[PDB]
Amino acid sequence: SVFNKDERIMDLVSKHYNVELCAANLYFHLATVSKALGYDNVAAFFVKMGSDKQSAHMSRLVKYMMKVDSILKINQISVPELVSFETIQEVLDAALKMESKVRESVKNVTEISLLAKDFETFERMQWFVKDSIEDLEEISDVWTYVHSPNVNLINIENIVGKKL
Amino acid sequence: SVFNKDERIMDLVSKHYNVELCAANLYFHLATVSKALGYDNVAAFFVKMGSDKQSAHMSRLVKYMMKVDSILKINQISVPELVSFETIQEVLDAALKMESKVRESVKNVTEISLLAKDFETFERMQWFVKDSIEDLEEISDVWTYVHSPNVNLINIENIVGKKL
Amino acid sequence: SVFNKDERIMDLVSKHYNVELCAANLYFHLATVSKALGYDNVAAFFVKMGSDKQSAHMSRLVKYMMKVDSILKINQISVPELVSFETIQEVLDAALKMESKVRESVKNVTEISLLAKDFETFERMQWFVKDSIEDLEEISDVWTYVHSPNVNLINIENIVGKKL
Amino acid sequence: SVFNKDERIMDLVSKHYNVELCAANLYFHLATVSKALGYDNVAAFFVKMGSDKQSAHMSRLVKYMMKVDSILKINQISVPELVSFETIQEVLDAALKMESKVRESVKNVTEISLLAKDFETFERMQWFVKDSIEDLEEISDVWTYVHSPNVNLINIENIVGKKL
Amino acid sequence: SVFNKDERIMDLVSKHYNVELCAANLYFHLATVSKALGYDNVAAFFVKMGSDKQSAHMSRLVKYMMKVDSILKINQISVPELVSFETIQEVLDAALKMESKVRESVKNVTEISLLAKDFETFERMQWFVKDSIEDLEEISDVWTYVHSPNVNLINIENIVGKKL
Amino acid sequence: SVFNKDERIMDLVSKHYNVELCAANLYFHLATVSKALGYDNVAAFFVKMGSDKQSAHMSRLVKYMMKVDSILKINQISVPELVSFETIQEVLDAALKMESKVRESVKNVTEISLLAKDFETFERMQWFVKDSIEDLEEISDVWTYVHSPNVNLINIENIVGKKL
Amino acid sequence: SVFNKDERIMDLVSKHYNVELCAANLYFHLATVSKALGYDNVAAFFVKMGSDKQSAHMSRLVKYMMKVDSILKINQISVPELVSFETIQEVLDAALKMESKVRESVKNVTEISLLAKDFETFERMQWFVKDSIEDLEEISDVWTYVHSPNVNLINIENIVGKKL
Ligand SMILES: [Fe+3]
Ligand SMILES: [Fe+3]
Ligand SMILES: [Fe+3]
Ligand SMILES: [Fe+3]
Ligand SMILES: [Fe+3]
Ligand SMILES: [Fe+3]
Ligand SMILES: [Fe+3]
Ligand SMILES: [Fe+3]
Ligand SMILES: [Fe+3]
Ligand SMILES: [Fe+3]
Ligand SMILES: [Fe+3]
Ligand SMILES: [Fe+3]
Ligand SMILES: [Fe+3]
Ligand SMILES: [Fe+3]
Ligand SMILES: [Fe+3]
Ligand SMILES: [Fe+3]
Ligand SMILES: [Fe+3]
Ligand SMILES: [Fe+3]
Ligand SMILES: [Fe+3]
Ligand SMILES: [Fe+3]
Ligand SMILES: [Fe+3]
Ligand SMILES: [Fe+3]
Ligand SMILES: [Fe+3]
Ligand SMILES: [Fe+3]
Ligand SMILES: [Fe+3]
Ligand SMILES: [Fe+3]
Ligand SMILES: [Fe+3]
Ligand SMILES: [Fe+3]
Ligand SMILES: [Fe+3]
Ligand SMILES: [Fe+3]
Ligand SMILES: [Fe+3]
Ligand SMILES: [Fe+3]
Ligand SMILES: [Fe+3]
Ligand SMILES: [Fe+3]
Ligand SMILES: [Fe+3]
Ligand SMILES: [Fe+3]
């Protein structure tokens, strides 16, 4: 291809796609867990988060790879490691860990692409640098609500409903 | 200048500008503290209060000084004395003390300008006499919410969100 | 906090807020000086510049700090050192020196955040890199008008009026 | 309360509320007297005056007291002393005496709040200073109509109808 | 008058006006008490209730009396007996007692007017028979909220705010 | 009259009407002088200032006197002392002196009425306290343009045209 | 000036301005007298007449003088000779005499300008020839109303209200 992208950097872009999809996959799982625990609005929140990963993150990554004629590889990175959840607090713990890993993945691809003088990839990653902050803040806020002392299921449902 | 304003009264107007800016500066600080404590809506409330001090209070004061060809002096009065905050209750304590000082500043400039027969300054201060009541009520209401017995973070966030 | 920002970098962001506020404070002061020297449109220009620092620069900085749960500290950096002004030329000299320092501050935070691999702060500073050019150009253009040979007060007022 | 109002001044504000209510009570009474004497439009005029006391005067007073956390006390001041009326002239005599007392009450609260340096109450009373003129003029004008020489019931009804 | 209403029934209509005004007077008092206790929305609720008594109840009664050329007499019945309130529960106790007395007054005038074959007054009272149920339900609902076990000030304020 | 105004204060109101009319009369004179000196836009500026005195200042004064049943007396105060003008600078000197006198007259009525406890007149003068600043600023601005070093007729005409 | 108007004719134009202003001054005085005598609508009629002299008559005269570079001089002709009025009939007597004099002054300027072959001034006076008839008719009609046998204050007020 005339774009002659380095396969190391493109593999990192592909890996970050798998990390965003791993998050999406986890969030759709956590939506069903949250609902079964009685948290309809927390469940809808996770559906929104997973849908956003598809429509805003994964879509930008696959579109960028096509712009530079590079190949997206899906693999086992995309499948989240599932533990058992007994409380809505444990659900949010897992979501916070996942989104924090998305953010670290963004930072890694951003740093390495700049190191490698791949300014096209560095430029495409800037949207993700900014938006990873937003996504981590959203999950962090809901983690705060469910971990706050002396809150009840209705309190959690009510305030999370205001993020939909 | 043909307006021949007395420098004593104009210095008091300038000082009150610094007091409104001190409040703005404190509120933007308290916004970041509130957010770090987990209170996104209380943080937004403080951003609103500080922005209002800029757009409604400081703007009217500097416009008035220009109408009468007098000089605005910014100085150390504008920099708030920062203590450490560990709870959202301590944050609101500091906000209540600050706005109460704004209100006392308004009263001082109002009283002294009338004493000095500066009816132009007395007239300009009437907006501030009225609005200082509103601003103190707003901060007082949020102080009441966070100090009420047996409330939780979600309760506070929910009711403060209704003031945005 | 889950964002785990480098306090030394976030302190630089907080210091840059104080530099933008120091510019705003100087411009509101220079508005009243300009007006008292007979320059109503130059005064309105400085009101616009200070108001823009509030609504576009300081707002973005405090919003960013809240996104990453970091603390904004206002201090004496925000208070401009005021010299006396006898001419509108000296007024614009002071404004040009101030905005040049704003631009150097932006560059410093941008450079240090990049070197520290704080890509989130580097990304947020890009808006300031671009806008600092604009603000410096605006003040430099007025500096050029008031320092050109053989211009009169009406000349200056008329052309500055076109910038409003 | 953080507003720390002077109870003796706020009691005067509460008494002025009772005076406005005493006027409203008298006007609703005088509406029924006017109607029974054959004066449908004069009766409608008194309904308008009493309704205005409720919606514009009493509403502003209780809103102000709530702004400063002060207590409204209704007492026997609010109950007008009723004499018998045989003519529409006597009806308007009573209304003129009443509204004149409303205006004296406004003046008293305004004067005492200023002397006490309660600028917040002085500011709130300014609307009443202006509007008491209007209300007294309206009643005095109808007084003039019904007391003019050689006028008949139809004359009075027709011209008062134009005030509705 | 050609309407020849019996003075006994008209005195009862006049007395019921005083009872609705007594309720209005109490509710405006209770608005200031509620606000001073920290309940801004409960205070607004009482302002709404008192304003409704003026605009919907008292207005219909004075209009009816004028239709039948009868005289409205305001007296001491209109002045509520004020006790001291220390809690928002005691405030709602007093409101519930007052509205319950309004409803009993409606029933008395309705029953006696029918007994007396005053079908005009019986017909006019039908609006009040229906609406007294609504007003007692509204106050009863807020009484229920403030007396419910384990509620806090924010809970009360939040749910009462939904009735405004 | 039921208004029972102090004729000494009302005579001051009437005198201030004559001072505003004196200013209007001077400005219509100076419009014709400015025009004859070659300054079409300065002439239009004076027509605007004189018309403003009529429609905004004199109108409010005569309307206030009628509200309180008091008598407006026009006398020699209203006739400006005319001197010869050879330059547009002399024209603006006269206008600046005149509007300074208007502002001083406003302050005199305001201060004396307040001292006399004529709160109705003090209230009516507040609009004049505020607007006298605006009118003096307007005339002062044109004075500044015509007195600035090294300006020509076209410069003056162009910038004054922007005020129309 | 290139227009080279004759000073005696332009002095007569300026004198006619003073006559229209004398009428305006008288009418604003008579408005306050009319109001104090109990005639709200007659007072509003005089405000209308005086305002029309300002906006329609005086404005055209000063605009014409500026067109031909001539100078407007206000002098004691503009100050009406006031006598005491005890009745609304005496008020209208004075107004009718004043407007008759305006009409005679129009005729005088029109006549001498034609004699002098000042066709520019003759042309400008044609608007005044026509409109003086209208203004005299208006005042004459109100004179007729207040001087008609057996009319009362309400009669006068009602029909004059139709002219507003
Ligand atoms: Fe549900
Ligand atoms: Fe996202
Ligand atoms: Fe998102
Ligand atoms: Fe948060
Ligand atoms: Fe809840
Ligand atoms: Fe709760
Ligand atoms: Fe949030
Ligand atoms: Fe405010
Ligand atoms: Fe506010
Ligand atoms: Fe409150
Ligand atoms: Fe809640
Ligand atoms: Fe900018
Ligand atoms: Fe800019
Ligand atoms: Fe030159
Ligand atoms: Fe120019
Ligand atoms: Fe009113
Ligand atoms: Fe009114
Ligand atoms: Fe007759
Ligand atoms: Fe009639
Ligand atoms: Fe509230
Ligand atoms: Fe109701
Ligand atoms: Fe209702
Ligand atoms: Fe219920
Ligand atoms: Fe609980
Ligand atoms: Fe609870
Ligand atoms: Fe709640
Ligand atoms: Fe010209
Ligand atoms: Fe003006
Ligand atoms: Fe103006
Ligand atoms: Fe100026
Ligand atoms: Fe020019
Ligand atoms: Fe130009
Ligand atoms: Fe006319
Ligand atoms: Fe006319
Ligand atoms: Fe009539
Ligand atoms: Fe008649």
Automatic annotation (TrEMBL), chains A, B, C, D, E, F, G:
Report the superkingdom from the record.
Bacteria
Question: PROSITE patterns from the xrefs?
Answer: FERRITIN_LIKE (PS50905)
The record's section on Pfam families has: Ferritin (PF00210)
InterPro entries under this entry? Answer: Ferritin-like (IPR012347), Ferritin-like_diiron (IPR009040), Ferritin-like_SF (IPR009078), Ferritin_DPS_dom (IPR008331)
Keyword Metal-binding among record annotations: yes
Query: In which residues is Fe(3+) 4 bound?
Result: D141
Task: Please state every residue range assigned to the domain named Ferritin-like diiron.
Answer: 3-150
What SUPFAM superfamilies does this protein map onto?
A: Ferritin-like
Residues recorded as binding Fe(3+) 1, renumbered to this chain, are D40, E137
A GO MF label: ferric iron binding
List, alphabetically, the Gene3D superfamilies matched: 1.20.1260.10
Q: Which UniProt keywords apply?
A: Metal-binding
Per UniProt, where does Fe(3+) 2 bind?
D52, H57, D131, D135
User: Which residues participate in Fe(3+) 3 binding?
Assistant: D52, D131, D135, E138
In its keyword annotation, does this UniProt entry include Metal-binding? Answer: yes
Q: What is this protein called?
A: Ferritin-like protein Rsg
Q: Which organism is it from?
A: Malacoplasma penetrans (strain HF-2)
